[PDB]
Design a protein around this nucleic acid. Structure first.
Ligand SMILES: [Mg+2]
Ligand SMILES: [Mg+2]
Length: 758
DNA sequence: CGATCACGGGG
DNA sequence: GTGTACGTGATCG
């Protein structure tokens, strides 16, 4: 029909699957049901006669036997060649994992294909359905919670003490203690506060629920407390509860009929930050400071009843900026969903590698191209161990007035012009081919490759959008078209990386190597042209470079660099484009994707160096921050080396507060399941021995004490530490904490680990 | 050594 | 759900 598709899933009714398509039609929520779409896989057989044995293969599920309902001989393409496979139909999606191994094991079966595509994704592809089409306006609600937390408690032990939400009508706080603020609704209990959140969500009926780390905190915490309090959370538009899906080592939460938009994985991909706290994220995007009120300050205010107005304001600002950030980041995710043809829920939680793959699976269907399979563990491992031939060590020391150049828009044009594809690689009986420089891989020119063909269409579509943008008087159309052309740029600039992605179906080591080798000819041209203009290249990798004019005035460097980019792009043919990325007052480079810079507004920017994580001591993270600050803010490496030397001496003379030595590590499974007992497990087992209910999710704080052997046998629980009796291991905090934190940084200045002590 | 195990965001 | 991240660095055995 007419509506915008926002999501799709399936339900089972009388044992049979039913697809649900969630739509928004002129402001109204609509669900379309489809009972007719059938699950399937493909099987390549050694001979057609074999189908008679194969169609009779069975399996078991839900106490019932699983059978192949129908078989169909089909003509498709595999690796740019016609092939005949058998389409095997199944009644239920859950029949596919139950029977697939029993088909694959059969001696007459060469291989099986497309056996791990989720039903809802299979449906959108096969039916040619695209989410997020049209000008349909969605509604948004940001949600956040504050809880009572004490160090090392099991997840969900303390109550939720506040629930905040925000939309265009304002930011509000729901709490069960008396706070006199205009945006605070006081209720009688935690139970009544959670039921109030349920009522707000059911009444506001948002299409999109925005959270900041809601997948792994707000919603698992709400579900834990609702379970304890024996109450339901009917937040789904079908009155279903939020659903926790194990997505890797972490969680993802869905709300049926809506889009649960968690900003945390979204922003982590979009921008570069050493730490993605909401306060650091808000400041990077809106250029305004946001105060952080820490867990201990919140617990103290709740328990004493003093300073609750500050905690309520913190809760309110958390929802207010979550709404603001959601409106900022949602349009690009909506266009990416549309482009790749999968819902925002899925697209916002995936890498660019998986965005490419879903775009390719859809295009393979449209072109009757059988998809290759994801690799098994051994293949994936063999791919990670593959060595690529044919990006030097960066210049040492501290440089001033650094311009950053980006090469990424070069590679789609290389893939297309040289027909770089796994289906064109080293083709037999090829009349014409392109030979990659240095590496010598041959790509057949006789037919367009599957991936070059698609990229060519993407680039052409982006140029049409850019042309329609120049000719548009409507600023609403322009804004939308700007997002659409940026979505293409993002997807197209991900193919180069996708070729080398070990999990990729269309993985091609020789394709990735060849793109690099052809790419290098232009990079070498950019580098020679920069050096002829007095520029010194400080750092270069496949994504870009950093350069300066040694000792030149900063405005002269900026002007010359901007003039250079305009010049080289006038020389480069086709859609090959170099981009001026930015300018930095100072910076230094350690190795590949290990560097630190500082811009003219004094903001430090690093890659592959900062260690802001709870399993490193504060003394190591504080010393590291001080070293970066001495180098970038003071331009003084000598001050940085003196900071390390002073810290190490203070550690040796037991002059460092024990609180700066605490290491935190989470328990992730029952204690009896550990194969290797690390210091936090050794500490945990002693706590459980004393009667402490140790559970997965509990974070263990410990200090390493002086003594013989592995650190596991010398770690003490932070609560058991007695400064009068226990002596911390100075050698451990020096050699395993402080020195590894700074040694990579100071190696860029010619210092070895042994020169950072008195 | 190879294997195992943790980090992030959020209170 | 036709499912179970990612890349990297510390410590155990
Ligand atoms: Mg879903
Ligand atoms: Mg909050």
């Amino acid at each position: 029909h007419a509506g915008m598709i926002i999501d799709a899933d399936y339900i089972t009714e009388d044992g049979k699957p039913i697809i649900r398509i969630f739509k928004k039609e002129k402001g109204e929520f609509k669900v379309e049901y489809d009972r007719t779409f059938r699950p399937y896989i493909y099987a390549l057989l050694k001979d057609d006669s074999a189908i008679d044995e194969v169609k009779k293969i069975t399996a078991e599920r839900h106490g019932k036997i699983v059978r192949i309902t129908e078989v169909e001989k089909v003509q498709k393409k595999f690796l740019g060649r016609p092939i005949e496979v058998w389409k095997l139909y199944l009644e239920h999606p859950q029949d596919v994992p139950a029977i697939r191994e029993k088909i694959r094991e059969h001696p007459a079966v060469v291989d099986i294909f497309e056996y791990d595509i989720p039903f809802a994704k299979r449906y959108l592809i096969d039916k040619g359905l695209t989410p997020m089409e049209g000008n349909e306006e969605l509604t948004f609600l940001a949600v956040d919670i504050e809880t009572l937390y004490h160090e090392g408690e099991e997840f969900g032990k303390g109550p939720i003490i506040m629930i905040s939400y925000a939309d265009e009508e304002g930011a509000k706080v729901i709490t069960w203690k008396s706070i006199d603020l205009p945006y605070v609704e006081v209720v009688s209990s935690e139970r009544e506060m959670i039921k109030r959140l349920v009522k707000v969500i059911r009444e506001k009926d948002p299409d999109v629920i925005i959270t900041y780390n809601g997948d792994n905190f707000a919603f698992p915490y709400l579900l834990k407390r609702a379970e304890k309090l024996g109450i339901k959370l009917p937040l789904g538009r079908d009155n279903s509860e939020p659903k926790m899906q194990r997505m890797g080592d972490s969680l993802a939460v869905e709300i049926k009929g809506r889009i649960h938009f968690d900003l945390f994985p979204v922003i982590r991909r979009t921008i570069n930050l050493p730490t993605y706290t909401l306060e650091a994220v808000y400041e990077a995007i809106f250029g305004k400071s946001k105060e952080k009120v820490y867990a201990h300050e919140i617990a103290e205010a709740w328990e004493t009843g003093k300073g609750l107005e500050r905690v309520a304001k913190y809760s309110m600002e958390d929802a207010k900026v979550t709404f603001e950030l959601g409106k900022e980041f949602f349009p690009m995710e909506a266009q990416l969903a549309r482009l790749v043809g999968q819902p925002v829920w899925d697209v916002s939680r995936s890498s660019t590698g998986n965005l490419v793959e879903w775009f390719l699976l859809r295009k393979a269907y449209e072109r009757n191209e059988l998809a290759p399979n994801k690799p098994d563990e051994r293949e994936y491992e063999r791919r990670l161990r593959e060595s690529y031939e044919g990006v030097k060590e960066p210049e040492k020391g501290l440089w001033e007035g650094i311009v950053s150049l980006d090469f990424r828009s070069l590679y789609p044009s290389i893939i297309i012009t040289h027909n770089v594809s796994p289906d064109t690689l080293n083709r037999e009986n090829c009349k014409e081919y392109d030979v990659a420089p240095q590496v010598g891989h041959r790509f057949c020119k006789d037919f367009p490759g599957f991936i070059p063909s698609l990229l060519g269409n993407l680039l052409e579509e982006r140029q049409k959008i850019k042309k329609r943008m120049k000719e548009s008087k409507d600023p609403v159309e322009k804004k939308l078209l700007d997002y659409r052309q940026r979505a293409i740029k993002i997807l197209a600039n991900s193919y180069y990386g996708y070729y080398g992605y070990a999990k990729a179906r269309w993985y091609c080591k020789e394709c990735a190597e060849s793109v690099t080798a052809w790419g290098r000819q232009y990079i070498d041209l950019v580098r020679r042209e920069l050096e002829s203009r007095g520029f010194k290249v400080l750092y270069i990798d496949t994504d870009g470079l950093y350069a300066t004019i040694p000792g030149a005035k900063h405005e002269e460097i900026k002007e010359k660099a901007l003039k250079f980019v305009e010049y080289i792009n006038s020389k480069l043919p086709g859609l090959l484009e170099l981009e001026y990325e930015g300018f930095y007052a100072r910076g230094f480079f350690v190795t590949k994707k290990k560097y630190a810079l500082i811009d003219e507004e004094g903001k430090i920017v690093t890659r592959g160096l900062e260690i802001v994580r709870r399993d490193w001591s504060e003394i190591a993270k504080e010393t590291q921050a001080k070293v970066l600050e001495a180098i970038l803010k003071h331009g003084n490496v000598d001050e940085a080396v003196k900071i390390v030397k002073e810290v190490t001496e203070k550690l040796s003379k037991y002059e460092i507060p024990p609180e700066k030595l605490v290491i935190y590590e989470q328990i992730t499974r029952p204690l009896s399941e550990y194969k290797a007992i690390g210091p936090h497990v050794a500490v945990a087992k002693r706590l459980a021995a004393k009667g402490v209910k140790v559970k997965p999710g509990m974070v263990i704080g410990y200090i390493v004490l002086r003594g013989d052997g592995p650190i596991s046998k010398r770690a003490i629980a932070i609560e058991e530490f007695d400064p009068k009796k226990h002596k911390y291991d100075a050698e451990y905090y020096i050699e395993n904490q402080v020195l590894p934190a700074v040694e990579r940084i100071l190696r860029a200045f010619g210092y070895r680990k042994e020169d950072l002590k008195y």
